[PDB]
RNA sequence: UUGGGCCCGGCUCUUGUCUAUGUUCCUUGGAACAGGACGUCACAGAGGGUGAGAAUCCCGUGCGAUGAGAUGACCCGGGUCU
RNA sequence: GCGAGAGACCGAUAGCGAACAAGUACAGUGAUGGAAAGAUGAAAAGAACUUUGAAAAGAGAGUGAAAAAGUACGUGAAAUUG
RNA sequence: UGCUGUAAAGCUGGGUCGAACGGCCUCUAGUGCAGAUCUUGGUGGUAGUAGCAAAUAUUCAAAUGAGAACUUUGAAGACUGAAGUGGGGAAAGGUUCCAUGUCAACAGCAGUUGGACAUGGGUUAGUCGAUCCUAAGAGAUGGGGAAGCUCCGUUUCAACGUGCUUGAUUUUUCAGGCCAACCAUCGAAAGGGAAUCCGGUUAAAAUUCCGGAACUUGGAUAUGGAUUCUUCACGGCAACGUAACU
RNA sequence: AGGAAUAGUUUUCAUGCCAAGUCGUACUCAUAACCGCAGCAGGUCUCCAAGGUUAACAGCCUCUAGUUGAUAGAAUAAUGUA
RNA sequence: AAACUUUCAACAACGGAUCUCUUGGUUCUCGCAUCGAUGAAGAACGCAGCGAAAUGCGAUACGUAAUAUGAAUUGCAGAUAUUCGUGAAUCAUCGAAUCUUUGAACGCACAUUGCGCCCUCUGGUAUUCCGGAGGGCAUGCCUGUUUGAGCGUCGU
């Protein structure tokens, strides 16, 4: 996930299993003030949902991840 | 410990919902630190603080509706007494005490006397 | 060839999971659970199978509501709140 | 199969979760009786029956 | 011969608080709750716990005392206005 | 079903199938079928340390009233075996 | 170790052991085992025995390691021989995938190896499927049976639209005009069906990610073009042509 | 039905703008990942298909790709199996 | 004579009998009447600082409120947690709440996390198109309301 943060401008989150892509995009806009280029989702083999959120070129995923606090 | 319930009941709807926002933001920050510390007992405190704020909001709003419907003939079914299904089908006190005038005259005319023996 | 060779041709399920009892007794073609009788309104049971009644009866689950009727009955089906002792 | 339904995959995830050995700190508790997980399942020995 | 609405009681139900007298000496033992000596309480020598058979170490047991809250057209002892 | 008190009852192959994470593990497409399994010690004090060995372990040591109690643990018969 | 009794049995010396138990007078019973191809559990001889022989076949050296016939690398010798011992999938399984560590049990020899064991990681779609359609068929509904669980009927003896389009009105009201033969619903990961390709990328994902280049459907809507004084375009004998062209 | 003259169209002509939800997606598909109690010579649907010989997608040899897996050693009586 | 076999004794094995217990079972008696559309019983899936189960609980998830009480919890860790106190722990008590996906199970459907419609608010230049939040739309029957149908029928 951190390789994708570095090398694809993409942020990786665990999300609620009931959420769709529209809600995830709205949530990241409301929580972190970023524009998602797209949201790709995935249900992991442990039953939890993973979202691949690529930001637009107007944002830097590494800087957002630093501000969030996990890098 | 966390937030105190008696202090929450002094706050208004806007103060309660803004304190809710602060607590959820603080829980989200703790889950980020969870990825590295990785044992945070503090998460338990913040979780139960949210439950208390959510409880106080819901009970504050439930009393507004109860005061709104006070004395109304028809009130929402989750504000009605919930004893059992059979007890709610039972005749009311007024309905069970109804008496025909024929029966009422008989009861008045011949009441059960109070008496003793040997005198 | 009715034994081992024929046993190799078992890859089509007659039953799948039942939404009501969760048991893998829902017959696919009949659309009926051989265990609880779903989607019939009443639960399947028989007096010639008492041990089957043991497996799935009141008290084998959570009793999330009946658990507290006896305590509520004792207190006269109170309405209101407890009053602080001064 | 690769083509599977949501309900099946949900059942599969739970079965993976329960297929773990006992956490070690359990055995240290006061009056503890469990020494191992008696409900282990291996994919080739016992089938899930779903 | 006279109806009903109300207030305090009783009774009925739930529930709080409170209680006697050895842990004295010797011997065995890792441990005394064992044995021996001298006792104490007992309307309490039921039962359990505590490092071995414990009335007297702890909880209880027995005996009562004293509060609180419900509920009853369809239980009664009194007031009460009509 | 809910709350209690009892017995010339059974005492872990007995007593309910189940005294234990028992209607569990497991079997059957399915209806259904359905076990085994209680006890170190008062207290883990569950054996520091040295030494031989790749290790498991062994030998010293140690704890304990007891190791003829070492989580293959109360006692530990017979068949069978050195 | 002995003693008593014809006997069923009783008592005692020594060893082991750790919490209860016995004599006498009576009461009571789920009261005495060698057998039941008895029941459950345990254990022998057989016996280090039968056996571990289908599918052409292995060898040298190095590395690792306590330990190498069996792991890895190199060098050979072979085989499957494209109707494969190759490369993918459907059903079924469900993490077996990958990396790291690890060898008590399992891999009927072995084990440093493994689909084993332990800890982590991993499955990204408007365009691939499902989802939709109907097939054989299944099945609600006014109903008709049946004591009833329910059975029968679906072209179903029924007053069966949670209709549609306008001229607009916003007054969230109107007003008309068209109709209602058919249509509850379920039934295909091989039938029918809107639309995506190439190159690159991971330890493990890719027609899904990255780079570039497209396409479909739904919606909004601006610009240009086209059309109109012969109002709703011209040309070709024709087959027909076109950027449009109620 | 609605449309002309100093003017209505139509997004079935070109260009431009916005959006496309949910679930599946790893891996095996078999002389060890499925079913036969098992890593069982059994069973289990289908796609791709090189050179030589040849009528031939048969048999025999080979390239790409993949394996070298099936306890092993020493001998070579009888009786077997092929 | 050894080996081997057999008998006995001692110690060591194998195995789990015996003995002693027992938060279990079994039977008898006594008292009580309280499930559900106000959504039960049951099912699925989740929830803990570190959990697989059992126990508990439901996105407020080994629990929230309230009342009582009065210093723990404990395997380890830990406070922006507490001690003459609105205060540790407490299914102690319990009257207020929360209560996922379901289930008689109720918009339709269900081997699908499939498909509508209505109302309010809200994002995208929007009465239609796309998104989000909240609230709704089952069947049989009863009483009533309103809107109707039939030369069944009265009168004008
Ligand atoms: C270590 N193995 C475990 C273990 O828990 C085992 O326990 C037995 C235990 O039951 C025995 O203890 C026994 O004690 C008496 C008496 C006959 O001994 C029995 O009646 C009783 O059932 C049993 N508790 C004990 N002597 C040996 C352990 N291995 O029981 C189950 C097991 C899987 O075999
Ligand atoms: C004596 N009473 C009769 C009553 O029995 C009934 O008649 C039915 C008639 O309706 C049926 O006929 C009806 O139903 C059939 C259906 C069964 O397929 C339809 O196909 C047909 O079109 C329809 N007319 C006829 N087939 C039988 C009569 N007894 O209806 C007519 C009636 C006069 O009331
Ligand atoms: Zn069922």
Contact C24 D7 (CB under 8 A): no
First vs last Cα of chain D: how many Å apart?
A: 13
Q: Which nucleotides of G are covered by protein (CB under 7 A)?
A: 89-96, 115-119, 122-126, 129, 138, 149-150, 189, 208-210
Torsion, Cα A52 A53 A57 A62, to 10 degrees, reads -80
Q: Which residues contact B46 (CB under 8 A, 6 or more apart)?
A: B2, B23, B26, B27, B30
H-only helix segments in D1-50: 6-17
Task: Say which experimental method was used.
Answer: cryo-EM
Give which of B66, B83, B63, B87 is closest to B75, Cα–Cα: B66
Residue written as token pair 């103060």: B15
Residue written as token pair 């806007």: B14
What angle do helix axes B42-68 and B13-33 make, rounded to 10 degrees? 160
Residue B96 near residue B49 (C-beta atoms within 8 A): no
Resolution of this deposited model, Å: 2.3
Residue written as token pair 């994919």: D43
Using the structure, give the distance in angstroms from the CA atom of D27 to the C1' atom of F39, rounded to a whole number: 19
Cα distances (Å, whole numbers) of residue B26 to B46, B49, B53:
8, 11, 14
Q: ∠ CA B55-A15-B31 to the nearest 5 degrees? A: 65
Residue A38 near residue A54 (C-beta atoms within 8 A): yes
For residues B55 and A27, give the distance between their C-alpha atoms in angstroms, rounded to a whole number.
25
């Amino acid at each position: 996930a951190m390789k994708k943060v570095e090398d694809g401008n993409t942020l990786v989150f665990q999300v609620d299993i009931k959420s769709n892509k529209h809600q995830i995009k709205s949530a990241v806009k409301e929580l972190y003030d970023v524009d998602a280029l797209y949201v790709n989702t995935l249900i992991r083999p442990n039953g939890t949902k993973k979202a691949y959120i690529r930001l637009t070129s107007d944002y830097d995923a590494l800087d957002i991840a630093n501000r969030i606090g996990y890098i | 410990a966390g937030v105190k319930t008696f202090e929450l009941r002094t706050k208004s709807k806007e103060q309660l919902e803004s304190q809710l926002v602060e607590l959820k933001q603080e829980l989200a920050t703790l889950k980020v630190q969870k990825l590295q510390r990785p044992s945070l007992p503090r998460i338990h405190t913040v979780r139960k603080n949210i439950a208390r704020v959510l409880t106080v909001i819901n009970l504050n709003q439930r009393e507004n509706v109860r005061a709104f419907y006070a004395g109304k003939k028809y009130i929402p079914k989750d504000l009605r007494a919930k004893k059992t299904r059979a007890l709610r089908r039972k005749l009311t006190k007024f309905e069970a005490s109804q008496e025909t005038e024929k029966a009422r005259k008989q009861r008045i005319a011949f009441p059960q006397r109070k008496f003793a023996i040997k005198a | 060839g009715k034994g081992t060779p024929s046993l190799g041709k078992r890859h089509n399920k007659s039953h799948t999971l039942c939404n009501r009892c969760g048991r893998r007794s829902f017959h696919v073609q009949k659309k009926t659970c051989s265990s609880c009788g779903y989607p019939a309104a009443k639960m399947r049971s028989h007096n010639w199978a008492l041990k089957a009644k043991r497996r799935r009866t009141t008290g084998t689950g959570r009793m999330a509501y009946l658990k507290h009727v006896t305590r509520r009955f004792k207190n006269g089906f109170q309405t209101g709140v407890a009053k602080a002792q001064t | 199969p690769s083509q599977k339904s949501f309900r099946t995959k949900q059942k599969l995830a739970k079965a993976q979760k329960q297929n773990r050995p006992l956490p070690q700190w359990i055995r240290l508790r006061t009056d503890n009786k469990i020494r191992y997980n008696a409900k282990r399942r291996h994919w080739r020995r016992t089938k899930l029956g779903i």
